[PDB]
């Protein structure tokens, strides 16, 4: 920018997207990375490996293609997270992938957070990942109980039209249940 | 002391004042002479060109310059001309003034390294080359043989 001596940050640091110091620690394991990413409306979960010209994603799952299996609820929430993890986890298994470490990118390791939820799912899918059980949510919040109870203080539907009024963490079970046997793309 | 002791550019460049102390001040009074208020807007421009790379102690520079400019008062204290000595005595010179034991000398002076062909002096004059004479006196006080070169001036 200023002169010939000026030092420009690596592109992905300019874009403030990749934390390279952490990326190096991640790569250390020599294992695939379970990339856990979020969006206001969605949640993504990828299984990345290292490659000659950049990373390779062998198995992925997005909270949007969740409906493709019967999801009729919002997609930027806990249950959605878990499930997207489990989904990717399974596609991962099919791909011949057995273990991976958790890459939560620039997110914060807050307990019971969606990433961790994503992690729990992928684990349950059959994937072996270094984790810590008591940093995860208490199964109920994963189901989406904290939300159903929030619509209890209703007076007005938490969901604008969408589906249900009192919401359904059961819809969660019905889905997890579904992903755990047969079906296409898994 | 003699020019013989310092006129050759055989030693390393020695100028880092950050590592040299007790360097004597230059005797050179000025570098810009004459009408320095004006810019080189003159018809004729003659230069004194050194013909051999050498080292010139500030001693010689001052004596040379004085003898030339002091003479350029054939034109008058406030005459119309501008004279410039473009080189500066950066190179610090020593003297081992014990015998050859611990002989790195002590700072005794400064000198300017000029390479054959550089112009050490440049004067600006209207068709009134009294300056050509000011230089036959100037190269009279510097080690090398010199060339009095005229540049803008096909007014022969």
């Amino acid at each position: 920018a200023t002169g010939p001596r000026y030092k420009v940050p690596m592109r992905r640091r300019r874009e403030a997207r990749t934390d390279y110091h952490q990326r190096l620690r991640l790569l250390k394991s020599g294992k695939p990375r379970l990339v856990a990413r979020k969006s206001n409306k969605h949640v993504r979960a990828q299984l990345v490996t290292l490659g000659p010209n950049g990373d390779d994603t062998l198995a992925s799952a997005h909270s949007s293609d969740l409906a493709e299996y019967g999801w009729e609820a919002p997609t930027g929430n806990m249950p959605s997270a878990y499930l997207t993890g489990l989904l990717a986890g399974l596609r991962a298994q099919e791909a011949g992938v057995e273990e991976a470490v958790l890459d939560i990118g620039l997110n914060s390791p807050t307990p019971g957070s969606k990433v961790f939820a994503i992690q729990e799912g992928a684990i349950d899918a059959g994937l072996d990942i270094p984790h810590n059980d008591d940093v995860l949510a208490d199964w109920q919040r994963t189901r989406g109980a904290h939300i159903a109870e929030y619509d209890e203080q209703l007076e007005e539907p938490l969901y604008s039209g969408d589906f249900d009024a009192a919401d359904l963490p059961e819809h969660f079970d019905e889905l997890r249940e579904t992903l755990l046997d047969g079906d296409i793309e898994l | 002391k003699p020019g013989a002791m310092y006129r050759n550019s055989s030693k390393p460049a020695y100028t880092r004042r950050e590592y040299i102390s007790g360097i004597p001040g230059k005797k050179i009074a000025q570098f810009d002479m004459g009408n320095n208020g004006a810019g080189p807007t003159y018809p004729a421009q003659v230069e004194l060109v050194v013909e051999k790379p050498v080292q010139i102690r500030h001693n010689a520079l001052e004596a040379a310059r004085v003898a030339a400019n002091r003479y350029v008062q054939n034109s008058g204290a406030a005459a119309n001309y501008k004279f410039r000595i473009r080189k500066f005595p950066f190179h610090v010179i020593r003297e081992n003034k014990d015998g050859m034991r611990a002989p790195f000398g002590k700072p005794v002076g400064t000198a300017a390294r000029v390479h054959g062909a550089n112009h050490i002096f440049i004067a600006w004059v209207n068709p009134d080359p009294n300056v050509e004479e000011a230089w036959r006196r100037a190269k009279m006080k510097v080690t090398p043989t010199i060339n009095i070169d005229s540049s803008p001036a096909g007014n022969a």
Partner: protein, 95 residues
């Protein structure tokens, strides 16, 4: 030399051109080499660990096993055979 430490006379080779300043890309600090591979040894001024004695900057040895994450590269110093413990951060594939 005025002293005999390992960095004596390394101002040049162990410094970065202004633009290559700052933390190096991880891709290469993780490269995997196989025994038998020829690799060029060059210290990365940005990477503190995994280094070797400066004297060998420039050498091109042959990877032979590793030790921990670090690799063990055989080189020949003049006429003497030597084994050098260096991490990938400081290695490049020949050719």
């Amino acid at each position: 030399p005025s002293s005999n430490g390992p960095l004596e006379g390394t101002r040049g080779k162990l410094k970065n051109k202004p633009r290559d300043r700052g933390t190096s890309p991880p891709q290469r600090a993780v490269e995997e080499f196989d025994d038998g591979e020829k690799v060029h040894l060059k210290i990365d001024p940005s990477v503190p660990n995994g280094r070797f004695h400066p004297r060998f900057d420039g050498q091109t040895g042959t990877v032979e096993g590793k030790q921990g994450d670090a690799y063990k590269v055989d080189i020949v110093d003049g006429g003497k055979e030597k084994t050098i413990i260096v991490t990938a951060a400081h290695l490049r594939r020949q050719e």
